[PDB]
Ligand SMILES: CC(=O)CC(=O)SCCNC(=O)CCNC(=O)[C@H](O)C(C)(C)COP(=O)(O)OP(=O)(O)OC[C@H]1O[C@@H](n2cnc3c(N)ncnc32)[C@H](O)[C@@H]1OP(=O)(O)O
C-alpha cells in the first residue's frame with residue numbers, strides 16, 4: 203500500500219533566544235552597536251517575522267572563541283564546520299531516538315536511512331555518524347542529502363515513499379537536522395538580505411519512521427504519502443542563491459520571493475489535487491513551509507484559505523523559526539498532535555486529504571499530498 | 578521488471594596529462610623543486626599507480642592565477658568552488674547529451690534525475706544547473722547527491738533501481754561528475770597520504786539512462802540491476818576521512834586500505850552471489866572501483882580471480898585514473914563496449930551475472946549485481 207508515516211520525533215538545541223531580544227543579543231555579540239540605524243532596521247525585521255523564539259546551537263562562547271564568525275566575510279568556515287559536523291548528527295540522533303521510541307519496534311528493523319541537512323559536509327557523512335550514534339545495522343541503506351535547503355522536507359518524503367513502496371518489509375528512518383551556525387553572519391549595510399536572514403532561521407531536527415504495509419496491531423499510521431511533485435518556478439533563479447565559501451554559507455535572497463510563490467502556488471495545488479477530484483482548497487488541510495511570514499500570507503491569499511487553515515504552520519514558525527529542511531516535518535507533527543488534542547475525527551484536522559509545500563533554491567516547490575488516518 | 582541500464586555516455590575535460598610526466602609537472606607548478614626526496618618519492622608513487630594519463634579541468638594558468646591552491650592549507654576553497662561549481666554540471670551535461678543521444682528517445686521523457694559528485698556544493702545545486710543546461714522538464718524529480726565519494730557509483734545505481742521500479746514508465750537519468758580540483762594540494766612532508774592522493778584521481782563524468790519495462794522496439798537493454806547492498810566494514814573508520822575546509826578537501830587515507838578491503842571482500846561477494854546459487858567467482862564478470870592499483874590486486878588475489886578478470890577495471894584506471902563516483906560507471910561502459918567489439922555472447926564478457934563494487938569512507942562497500950543481456 204502507500205508509504206505511511208508511522209512515527210515522528212523532534213529535538214532542538216537547549217539554548218533558546220526570544221525574538222523580542224534577538225536584535226540586542228545580535229548587535230552586542232557581533233560588536234556592532236555602532237550601527238544604530240541597521241540595528242533599528244533589524245528590530246523592525248524581527249518584529250515582522252512572527253517568530254516568538256528560536257533554539258540555537260551557536261552560543262556566545264563559541265563566537266567569542268571564533269570571532270571571525272562575527273566579521274562579515276572573514277574566513278570562518280573551519281569554525282563553522284567544527285560545530286555542525288558533530289552538531290548535526292548529534293541533534294538528529296536526539297530526534298531519531300524519540301521517533302524510534304514512539305514507533306516501538308526494534309531499531310534492527312530499520313532498513314534504509316535518509317539523512318538530510320543544509321549545514322556543513324564531511325566524509326564519512328552525517329548519515330554514517332548517525333548509524334554509529336544510534337547503533338543501526340551496518341548494512342542499513344543510506345541516502346546522504348547535503349546542502350539541501352528549504353524544500354527538502356518535501357524531498358525526504360518523496361524519496362522515502364519510493365524506498366518504502368519498492369522494498370517489501372522495509373522501514374525507512376528519515377532525519378532532517380539543521381544547525382543555522384553555518385549561515386550566521388555579522389551585520390553589513392551592503393547585504394541587507396543577509397541581515398534579514400539573521401532573523402529567519404532556527405535550529406532543530408525531525409525524524410520520521412515510514413513504511414508500507416503497517417502491522418496495525420503494533421504500528422500506528424499517522425498519514426499516508428499519496429503523491430509527490432517537484433517543479434522549478436519559471437524565471438525565479440535569482441530568488442535564492444547560497445554559496446559555501448571560506449566565510450560560511452553566503453546569502454542572496456530576493457525581496458520578491460513571496461510574490462514569486464504567489465504567482466505559482468495555485469498551479470501546484472491544482473496539479474496535486476485535480477487528480478483526486480478535489481477543487482475546493484478549504485476542503486483539505488495545509489502544511490506550508492514558513493520560509494517567512496509573508497510567504498504564508500501569500501499562500502493563504504492566493505488559495506483563498508480561511509483564517510485558521512495555516513495555524514499549524516504559523517505555530518511552528520512562532521515557536522521555532524524557519525527550521526529549513528526539518529520545518530514542514532515539525533508541521534506534520536503539530537497537525538497530528540493538535541488534531542488528537544482537539545478530538546478530531548482524523549489526524550489531518552478532521553479532514554481526509556492535505557497538501558504540504560516545501561520552497562527552496564531554483565525556485566523549487568515540492569508538493570506532497572498526504573492522506574489522514576481515521577481515528 | 579528490473580531496473581535496466583539502457584544507455585551510457587561519458588565525457589572528460591580536454592586537458593590530458595601523462596602520468597610519466599606528472600611528477601615533474603606537479604613539483605614545477607607547485608614550486609616545490611627543493612623538496613627533492615619528496616619529489617623522488619612522488620615519482621615512485623606515480624610509477625606504482627598503473628595509470629597512464631588523466632584528464633584534468635584544473636589548468637596551470639588557473640593555478641598561477643590562484644596561487645593559494647598550491648600552498649599546503651592556505652585558504653583556497655573559493656578558488657576551488659569558482660572552478661567546480663560551473664565545471665561539474667557542464668562536464669556532466671556533456672556526458673548526459675551522449676547518453677541521451679544513444680538512447681534516442683525524447684529528453685522530455687526523463688522523469689527523474691540523480692546528480693552525484695564529490696567536488697563542491699552550491700545552492701541551487703548542480704542538479705538544477707544540469708536541468709537548465711540540458712533543457713529537462715522543470716518538473717523532473719531530482720536527487721542531489723553531494724560529497725558522495727568513491728562508493729557512490731554503486732549508490733546511484735541503488736537509488737535509480739528503486740525509482741525506476743516503483744514509478745511505472747519512469748526514466749531516470751543518472752549523472753556522476755567529478756573534478757579533482759577540489760582536492761589538489763601542494764606537497765608536504767607531514768602529509769604523505771595527501772601526497773599519494775595527488776597521483777590517484779582524474780576527472781570525468783558518466784551518464785546513464787535507467788528504466789524498467791524497456792520498449793524493445795526502440796530501447797536497448799545493456800544490463801539489468803538485480804540487487805544492491807551497502808555495508809560498513811568493521812573497524813575501518815580511520816581508513817578514510819576527508820574534510821571540506823578553508824584549504825579545500827583534506828585527506829586522511831590509511832596505508833592499509835587495500836588490506837581492509839581484502840579482509841572483507843569475499844563476504845561481500847558471497848552475500849550478493851549466494852542467493853543466486855553462485856559460488857564460482859570466475860563464472861561472473863567483475864567491475865571493481867579502482868581506488869588504487871593495490872585495491873584491484875587485493876580483490877583479485879582474495880577472490881582468486883583468473884588473470885584477466887579485472888581487465889576492464891584496470892583499463893579505465895590506466896586511461897583515466899580513479900574517477901571517484903563515476904569510475905565504476907566508466908567500467909560498466911568499458912565492459913559492454915569491449916564485449917560487443919570482441920563478439921561475446923552477452924554484454925558482460927559472455928557471462929550471465931556480474932558484480933560491481935564501490936569503496937568509500939565509513940569504510941563503506943556498495944555491492945551491485947548486474948545481469949548481462951544476450952548479444953543477438
Ligand atoms: C537555505 C535555503 O535553502 C534558502 C533560504 O534562504 S529560503 C529563505 C526564504 N524566506 C524568505 O525569503 C522570505 C522572507 N520574507 C518575509 O517573510 C517578510 O518579507 C519578512 C518577515 C522578511 C519582513 O516582513 P514584511 O512584511 O515583508 O516587511 P517589510 O517592512 O516589507 O520588510 C522588513 C524590512 O526588511 C526589508 N527586507 C525584506 N526582505 C528583504 C530581502 N530579501 N532583502 C533586502 N531587504 C529585505 C524591507 O525592505 C524592510 O525594511 P525597512 O523597515 O528598513 O523599510
Ligand SMILES: CC(=O)CC(=O)SCCNC(=O)CCNC(=O)[C@H](O)C(C)(C)COP(=O)(O)OP(=O)(O)OC[C@H]1O[C@@H](n2cnc3c(N)ncnc32)[C@H](O)[C@@H]1OP(=O)(O)O
Pocket residue numbers: 325618621622625626627695725726727728769770773777817819830831832833834835868869870871872901936937938
Ligand atoms: C575521495 C574519497 O571518497 C576517498 C578516497 O580518497 S578513497 C582513495 C582510495 N585509494 C587508495 O587508498 C590507494 C590504495 N593504494 C594503492 O593502490 C597503492 O598503495 C599505490 C598505487 C598508492 C602504491 O602501490 P604500492 O604497490 O602499494 O607501493 P608501495 O611502494 O608500497 O608504495 C608507494 C609509496 O607510497 C607510500 N604510500 C602508499 N599509500 C600510503 C598512504 N595511504 N599514506 C602514506 N604513504 C603511503 C609507501 O609508503 C611507498 O613509499 P616509498 O617509496 O617512499 O617507500
